[PDB]
Amino acid sequence: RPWSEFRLTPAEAAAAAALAARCAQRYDETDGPEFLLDAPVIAHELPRRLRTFMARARLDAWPHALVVRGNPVDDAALGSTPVHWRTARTPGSRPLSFLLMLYAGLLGDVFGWATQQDGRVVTDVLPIKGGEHTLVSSSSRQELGWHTEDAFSPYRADYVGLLSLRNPDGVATTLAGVPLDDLDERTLDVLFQERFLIRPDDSHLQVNNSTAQQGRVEFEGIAQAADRPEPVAILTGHRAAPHLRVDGDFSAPAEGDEEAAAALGTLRKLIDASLYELVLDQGDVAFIDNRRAVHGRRAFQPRYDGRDRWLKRINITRDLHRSRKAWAGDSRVLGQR
């Protein structure tokens, strides 16, 4: 497969769950300063074979994601899928939120955005009634188009963690790498040049955060990024294994640049053609390499009966200090005037 996969034994899965439950019993919340600081060290107590996989798989040159299968989730204990992310920090999902953060701590520094889901570090992906055909992760009936997470920002995550709390109908996450087998060298050259506009996605809009959140200054920076985007490259680094920065619905060529436009149009077609599926079943966790791959989610018919698909999500950077300009006044929650 194009991702690296690990399956917990029942004993390993139970041990990780017990550790997460212990943390949930000793800390007030996942996003509190105390657990944010302690989690990477507590994560050292996770099963050795899992720690070995995470340390090595992160250093491999090829995988689009690190996938860990086999975390038990009891639907009765978990309770119904929340109707909105606002009310999604349910007691039943609490230990799994701690588990996600522990796993994330093995890969890097977790963080959130001042302008997304009220500045939470652990966020929620679930269908919101009335928001089926939006461009945000709470969509359903409309496919979530492929994207680099927070592509607009130089402080975007290196890894995006997704823990499936439930996914009864097996809705697929989509993934694609750089279509290096099909990009001609001229097109590749153009994609490496600063000739593209990438605007913030709709999750950073005031309407998709709680009221009175909301007037906070960090939405100014989002407005600037949308109104006056600076030209940037889509590809960076090594020509034989480039890093990728693009969003199918929020990228554009630089104004009047038809060669750049042609390169982007070609890239869209090649990514559409090479897009593949990863189904995160209940208890599966994926850490998507946000530099090597774009990701999305297939269209699905939401249930709205209390058993809708539901993920916990977390943004991870290899170096928090890279984003210090955007340390709102925290750190761990990013944004700018």
Which residues contribute to the site for a copy of itself (CB under 8 A)? 37-38, 40-41, 44, 48, 51-52, 55-56, 59, 61, 109, 158, 237-239, 241, 291, 318-322, 324-325, 331
Which helix (DSSP H) or strand (DSSP E) does residue 123 occupy?
Answer: strand 122-125
Q: How far is the CB of 9 from a copy of itself (least distance, A)?
A: 18
Q: Which is nearer to Fe ion, 247 or 257 (CB)?
A: 247
The residues of the shown chain that bind Fe ion, judged by CB under 5 A, are 149
Q: How far is the CB of 133 from a copy of itself (least distance, A)?
A: 36
Regarding 203 and contact with ligand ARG (CB under 6 A), the answer is yes
Residue ranges of the alpha helices (H) in the chain?
A: 10-26, 33-42, 48-57, 75-78, 94-105, 185-191, 218-227, 258-274
Q: How far is the CB of 61 from ligand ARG (least distance, A)?
A: 26
The C-alpha angle 258, 264, 265, rounded to 5 degrees, equals 85
Q: Is 1 annotated as a binding residue?
A: no
Q: Is 295 annotated as a binding residue?
A: yes
Q: Which is nearer to ligand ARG, 43 or 314 (CB)?
A: 314
Q: Is 309 annotated as a binding residue?
A: yes
What whole-number distance in Å separates Cα of residue 199 and Cα of residue 186? 25
Q: Which is nearer to ligand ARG, 12 or 158 (CB)?
A: 158
Cβ neighbour number for residue 131 with a 10 Å cutoff: 18
Q: Which stretch binds ligand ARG (CB under 6 A): 10-18, 79-87, 246-254, 270-278?
A: 246-254
End-to-end CA distance of the chain: 42
Q: Footprint of ligand ARG on residues 41-100 (CB under 6 A)?
A: none
Q: Is 164 annotated as a binding residue?
A: no
Buried b (16+ CB within 10 A) or exposed e, 11-50: ebbebbbebbeebbeebebbbeeebbebbbebbeebbeeb
Tokens representing 63 are 């995988």
Query: Could you say which of a copy of itself, ligand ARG, Fe ion, none residue 321 binds, taking C-beta under 5 to 8 angstroms by partner kind?
Result: a copy of itself
Cα of 200 vs its chain's centroid, Å: 14
Q: Is the peptide bond before 93 cis (omega within 30 degrees of 0)?
A: no
Regarding 201 and contact with ligand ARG (CB under 6 A), the answer is yes
Q: How far is the CB of 160 from ligand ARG (least distance, A)?
A: 9
Q: Is 173 annotated as a binding residue?
A: yes
Q: Footprint of ligand ARG on residues 125-144 (CB under 6 A)?
A: 135-137, 144
Q: How far is the CB of 125 from a copy of itself (least distance, A)?
A: 26
Q: Which is nearer to a copy of itself, 37 or 273 (CB)?
A: 37
Q: Is 207 exposed, middle or buried (0-12, 13-18, 19+ CB in 10 A)?
A: exposed
- Check if the beta carbon of residue 3 is closer than 8 Å to that of residue 175: yes
Q: Is 238 annotated as a binding residue?
A: no
| Pairing between β-strand 293-297 and β-strand 172-177 as defined by DSSP bridges | antiparallel
| Pairing between β-strand 293-297 and β-strand 109-113 as defined by DSSP bridges | unpaired
Q: How far is the CB of 153 from a copy of itself (least distance, A)?
A: 14
Read off the amino acid at residue 208.
Answer: N
What whole-number distance in Å separates Cα of residue 184 and Cα of residue 182? 6
Q: How far is the CB of 309 from a copy of itself (least distance, A)?
A: 31
| Contacting residue, 169, 230, 249, 277, with ligand ARG by CB under 6 A | 249
Interacting residues toward ligand ARG by CB under 6 A = 135-137, 144-145, 147, 149, 201, 203, 247-250
Going by the annotation, the residues of the binding site for 2-oxoglutarate are 173, 309, 313
Binding site, annotated residues for Fe cation: 147, 149, 295
